[PDB]
Ligand binder design. Structure first.
Ligand SMILES: NC(=O)c1ccc[n+]([C@@H]2O[C@H](COP(=O)([O-])OP(=O)(O)OC[C@H]3O[C@@H](n4cnc5c(N)ncnc54)[C@H](OP(=O)(O)O)[C@@H]3O)[C@@H](O)[C@H]2O)c1
Ligand SMILES: NC(=O)c1ccc[n+]([C@@H]2O[C@H](COP(=O)([O-])OP(=O)(O)OC[C@H]3O[C@@H](n4cnc5c(N)ncnc54)[C@H](OP(=O)(O)O)[C@@H]3O)[C@@H](O)[C@H]2O)c1
Ligand SMILES: C[C@H]1CNc2nc(N)[nH]c(=O)c2N1
Ligand SMILES: C[C@H]1CNc2nc(N)[nH]c(=O)c2N1
Lengths: 237, 237
């Protein structure tokens, strides 16, 4: 009933295929890293070696847009990355989209200053106009409310991105945003690097919040390196 | 730099070898299960299928003693298990050891009633005598203090078990106890079942507490089944 996994193929070229987005339709992929004991932070960078950086950069290269919660904002491509993106018919650098319920973003933000192009600000119908005026010249502000003008509806958010030709979506956090995607069951795929460390009880998980679900996912692949990291890809359902 | 893992060997007999304890010396192994998003509970049973039950029972079968914190106590072997244990020179059923700093255990406890043999109660020098008197007939009470008679020293605990011929140690929790083992760096091995679910932000991790470490571990193996569970074994350092 059990089978041993082992190294069977040196990844030839072949990696982007293992992380391909579907040929059509919207697809929301998350990429996170955690310790063996489920801790997300030490930031997570301390747990991330060269292999994980390689996967991380690849997933950014494949994405139309990278969606990030505003807590975490408090995107570089190199020549080859830009080439590959252009060949596949994408913008040279992926768009950044920042999720905020309050819209309380400052112009003086690091996020607005060191980019090639204006990020998207994804927010509610209720604060969209004022946010649009305050961020004039810096960001495109998009209302992502469903039935309730005072909240962000995750399915609507995803649809708003798709409607702008940004159907291949990547999110890297933070844990609150990811927790809402998981709670609302709009997360299509989780790529998770399992780092070979234990960190003890203090650290938070890769998801936080009040939500509680039991969403079955299918294991699409597990990669590894000599350092004993596991680079996993799981897909609904 | 990356290699693809895949199924290469149907586990013939062969499983206990993959989970062997060292031939001599003390060895503290933990066995836990968690979701992809690092949640330990839904209890953890809801995430545990037949494969995980099989591994769980095997690890109990291999152990000299199972150490559990008192929060979690609020051990069956079948004929074949007993045979195997006897062949390897072990007691027919592994000993249970309950860790308590306060010693505040009641005689009326479920843990004392449905067992073949008296559990060990691992506690402090300061409360050992009174605990010994209250639990007369039900438990052997062992003081596990190091320099401080009011605390449990994890290294001493492990040594007290070893001194009684119980050098092959398994712990299944709870998260506070595991968190102290991790914090004190006395955990030699973690067997971790990664269940193919996300559960959202509410659940706790497999470890809790104030501790914060960065302990590198080596990946000894990863097993899998058709359901997409990963049964991992990591070892210090
Ligand atoms: O904090 P952290 O470490 O957990 O990182 P984080 O998820 O990146 O930051 C959380 C913040 O981003 C915004 N956010 C996350 N999820 C949201 C959602 N479903 N709808 C609207 N806004 C959302 C909120 O900002 P706002 O408080 O500005 O709404 C929230 O306070
Ligand atoms: O709670 P839970 O869900 O996290 O499950 P748990 O770890 O099984 O239960 C925690 C309890 O077990 C005892 N314990 C755990 N670690 C200990 C240590 N290093 N030294 C002394 N006692 C320890 C304590 O009991 P006491 O409060 O009785 O000392 C503690 O309150
Ligand atoms: C901030 C986090 C976010 N998500 C991640 N995912 C992987 N795989 N590696 C990281 O360093 C990080 N950093
Ligand atoms: C109570 C927990 C304890 N540790 C475990 N480890 C595995 N692998 N499976 C479980 O159900 C459990 N149950």
């Amino acid at each position: 009933p059990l089978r041993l996994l082992s190294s069977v193929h040196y990844l030839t070229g072949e990696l982007p295929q293992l992380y391909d987005y579907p040929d059509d339709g919207t697809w929301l992929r998350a990429n996170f890293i955690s310790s063996l004991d489920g801790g997300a932070t030490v930031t997570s960078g301390a747990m991330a070696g060269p292999g994980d950086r390689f996967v991380f950069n690849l997933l950014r290269e494949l994405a139309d847009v990278i969606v990030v919660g505003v807590g975490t904002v408090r995107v570089r491509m190199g020549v080859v990355q830009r080439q590959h993106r252009q060949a596949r018919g994408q913008s040279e650098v992926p768009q950044l989209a920042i999720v905020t319920r309050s819209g309380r973003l400052d112009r003086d933000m690091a996020v607005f200053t060191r980019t090639e192009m204006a990020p998207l600000v994804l927010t509610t119908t209720a604060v969209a106009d004022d946010t649009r005026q305050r961020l004039a010249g810096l960001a495109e502000v998009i209302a992502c409310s469903g039935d309730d003008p005072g909240t962000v509806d995750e399915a609507v958010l995803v649809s708003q991105l798709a409607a702008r030709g940004l159907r291949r979506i990547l999110t890297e956090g933070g844990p609150t945003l990811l927790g809402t995607f998981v709670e609302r069951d709009v997360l299509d795929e989780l790529c998770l690097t399992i780092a070979p460390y234990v960190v003890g009880g203090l650290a938070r998980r890769i998801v936080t919040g009040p939500g509680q679900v039991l969403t079955r996912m299918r294991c699409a692949h597990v990669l590894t390196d000599d350092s004993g990291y596991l680079y996993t890809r799981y897909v609904k359902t």
